Swiss-Prot record, chain B:
It comes from the Eukaryota. DNA-dependent RNA polymerases catalyze the transcription of DNA into RNA using the four ribonucleoside triphosphates as substrates. Component of RNA polymerase I (Pol I) which synthesizes ribosomal RNA precursors. Besides, RNA polymerase I has intrinsic RNA cleavage activity. RPA190 and RPA135 both contribute to the polymerase catalytic activity and together form the Pol I active center. In addition, subunit RPA12 contributes a catalytic zinc ribbon that is required for RNA cleavage by Pol I. The chain holds residues 638 to 784 of 1664 of the full protein. Component of the RNA polymerase I (Pol I) complex consisting of 14 subunits: RPA135, RPA190, RPC40, RPA14, RPB5, RPO26, RPA43, RPB8, RPA12, RPB10, RPC19, RPC10, RPA49 and RPA34. The complex is composed of a horseshoe-shaped core containing ten subunits (RPA135, RPA190, RPB5, RPO26, RPB8, RPB10, RPC10, RPA12, RPC19 and RPC40) where RPA135 and RPA190 form the DNA-binding cleft. Outside of the core, RPA14 and RPA43 form the stalk that mediates interactions with transcription initiation factors and newly synthesized RNA. It is found in: Nucleus, Nucleolus. This is DNA-directed RNA polymerase I subunit RPA190. Present with 2840 molecules/cell in log phase SD medium. Belongs to the RNA polymerase beta' chain family.
From Swiss-Prot, chain C:
It comes from Saccharomyces cerevisiae (strain ATCC 204508 / S288c) (Baker's yeast). Present with 8680 molecules/cell in log phase SD medium. The chain holds residues 40 to 142 of 142 of the full protein. The lineage of its organism: Eukaryota, Fungi, Dikarya, Ascomycota, Saccharomycotina. Keywords: DNA-directed RNA polymerase, Isopeptide bond, Nucleus, Phosphoprotein, Ribosome biogenesis, Transcription, Ubl conjugation. It comes from the Eukaryota. One of its GO terms (cellular component) is RNA polymerase III complex. Component of the RNA polymerase I (Pol I) and RNA polymerase III (Pol III) complexes. Component of the RNA polymerase I (Pol I) complex consisting of 14 subunits: RPA135, RPA190, RPC40, RPA14, RPB5, RPO26, RPA43, RPB8, RPA12, RPB10, RPC19, RPC10, RPA49 and RPA34. The complex is composed of a horseshoe-shaped core containing ten subunits (RPA135, RPA190, RPB5, RPO26, RPB8, RPB10, RPC10, RPA12, RPC19 and RPC40) where RPA135 and RPA190 form the DNA-binding cleft. One of its GO terms (biological process) is nucleolar large rRNA transcription by RNA polymerase I. This is DNA-directed RNA polymerases I and III subunit RPAC2. It is found in: Nucleus, Nucleolus. Belongs to the archaeal Rpo11/eukaryotic RPB11/RPC19 RNA polymerase subunit family.
From Swiss-Prot, chain D:
DNA-dependent RNA polymerases catalyze the transcription. of DNA into RNA using the four ribonucleoside triphosphates as substrates. Common component of RNA polymerases I, II and III which synthesize ribosomal RNA precursors, mRNA precursors and many functional non-coding RNAs, and small RNAs, such as 5S rRNA and tRNAs, respectively. This is DNA-directed RNA polymerases I, II, and III subunit RPABC3. Component of the RNA polymerase I (Pol I), RNA polymerase II (Pol II) and RNA polymerase III (Pol III) complexes. Component of the RNA polymerase I (Pol I) complex consisting of 14 subunits: RPA135, RPA190, RPC40, RPA14, RPB5, RPO26, RPA43, RPB8, RPA12, RPB10, RPC19, RPC10, RPA49 and RPA34. The complex is composed of a horseshoe-shaped core containing ten subunits (RPA135, RPA190, RPB5, RPO26, RPB8, RPB10, RPC10, RPA12, RPC19 and RPC40) where RPA135 and RPA190 form the DNA-binding cleft. The keyword Nucleus applies. Keywords: Acetylation, DNA-binding, DNA-directed RNA polymerase, Nucleus, Phosphoprotein, Ribosome biogenesis, Transcription.
Length: 46, 147, 103, 134
């Protein structure tokens, strides 16, 4: 909603809707503590 | 999860065992996939016989009372299907013994008349090996497939 | 002198009230001793049920279940099994030495 | 005590892609309407075509707690016969007037006896011993 300056600096509306948005990227979904990731391997003995 | 309420939920609601049937069609999404299916067709075959030493080994090999697999605190064993000349156990008897030690003693055995993927023609003349028969928790007829 | 307590362990969670049935857990052992020991224990006329089970390949454990009839505990059946396997090995070692000389 | 006893003539011995089991088709030498279909472990007790087998059904051997391996000085009904099997009766079928056919299972090894008079003695018991001679 601002005039073109000879990519502009994002406004507070842009901050809440950067990509998916603050609500989708940091409220509905979040990075968590006490969690791990690894490639799975098969095992019939467990 | 870092608290007991979250623990109870992951052990009683979202736990694997409570997800045997999918809510999409109410059909199973849990079962054995390849080696186990081929192993079962061979183990439950009429030709598969086992000595006392072999039979008891296969039982303890999969059922460990110390890991809480039993319901009787002592591994119960069926008598052999062949008494004379040599004492021999059938392959189907191992399946009967596994159920006899994992199902509650207070409840009676399972009664089911199911079918197989393998037609009777493959097992020779006059075989009923397609008809899966369970009478009082005892596999008396038919092999066990992916089915 | 100090005896090792971590090797053979009696799984009290599976032991019969008294005294015939018990499950034993041995560390740093597998099929090598396992199948040989259950074979010898099964030759005992008092042993009702016997088998061996390895919980998982990654963990260094060996489980051996001994269920006997009366007048003999599972501990005695295990002690007889070990005593007989030692004597069995002596027979193998004696016969091999004799055939080396016989050559 | 005994529930059934007869001498049968073997008409067929079919393996059917089995290396140790065979489906035996037999007929009674005494009764005309009597027929037999039985699976036996041919590896231990071999059966040939045109053979005389003394098939006998017993309730037990002359209260037991459990099966024990043989130990010196043990006497049994099995000592009189060659091949002995333990199994259960799972189905009772009636074929026309007076004729009745029973279905037995010795752990997958199935048996189908057809007769008429045995309706009283042969009952669906979770314990039935099958003993064969010659």
């Amino acid at each position: 909603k601002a005039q073109g300056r000879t990519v502009p600096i994002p406004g507070v509306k842009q901050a809440l809707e950067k990509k998916e948005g603050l609500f989708r990227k940091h409220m509905m979904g979040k990075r968590v503590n006490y969690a791990a990731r690894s490639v799975i391997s098969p095992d019939p003995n467990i | 999860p870092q608290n007991e309420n979250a623990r109870a939920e992951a052990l009683n609601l979202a736990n694997t065992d409570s997800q045997y049937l999918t809510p999409t069609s109410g059909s199973p999404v849990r079962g054995l996939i390849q080696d186990h299916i081929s192993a079962g067709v061979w183990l439950t075959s009429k030709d598969s016989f086992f000595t006392r030493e072999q039979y008891q080994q296969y039982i303890y090999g999969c059922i460990r009372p110390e890991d809480g697999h039993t319901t009787r605190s002592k591994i119960v064993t069926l008598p052999p299907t062949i008494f004379k000349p040599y004492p021999l156990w059938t392959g189907k008897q191992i399946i009967t013994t596994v159920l006899l030690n994992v199902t509650p003693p207070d409840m009676p055995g399972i009664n089911l008349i199911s079918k197989n993927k393998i037609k009777n023609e493959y097992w020779g003349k006059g075989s009923l090996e397609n008809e899966v028969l369970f009478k009082d928790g005892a596999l008396l007829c038919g092999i066990l497939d992916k089915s | 002198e100090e005896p090792d307590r971590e090797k053979i362990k009696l799984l009290t969670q599976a032991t019969s009230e008294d005294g015939t049935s018990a499950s034993f857990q041995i560390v740093e052992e597998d099929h090598t001793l396992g199948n040989a020991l259950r074979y010898v224990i099964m030759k005992n006329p008092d042993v009702e049920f016997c088998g061996y089970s390895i919980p998982h390949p990654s963990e260094n454990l060996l489980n051996i279940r001994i269920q006997t009839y009366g007048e003999t505990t599972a501990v005695d059946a295990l002690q007889k099994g070990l005593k007989d396997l030692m004597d069995l090995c002596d027979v193998v070692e004696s016969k091999f030495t004799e055939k080396i000389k016989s050559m | 005590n005994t529930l059934f006893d007869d001498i049968f003539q073997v008409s067929e011995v079919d393996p059917g892609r089995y290396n140790k089991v065979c489906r035996i088709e037999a007929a009674s030498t005494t009764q005309d309407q009597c027929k037999l279909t039985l699976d036996i472990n041919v590896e231990l007790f071999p059966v040939a075509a045109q053979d005389s087998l003394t098939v006998t059904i017993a309730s037990s051997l002359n209260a037991t707690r459990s099966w024990r391996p043989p130990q010196a000085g043990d006497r049994s009904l099995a000592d009189d016969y060659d091949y002995v099997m333990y199994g259960t009766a799972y189905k009772f079928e009636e074929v026309s007037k007076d004729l009745i056919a029973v279905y037995y299972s010795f752990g997958g090894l199935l048996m189908r006896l057809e007769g008429n008079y045995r309706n009283l003695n042969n009952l669906k018991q979770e314990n039935a011993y099958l003993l064969i001679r010659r």
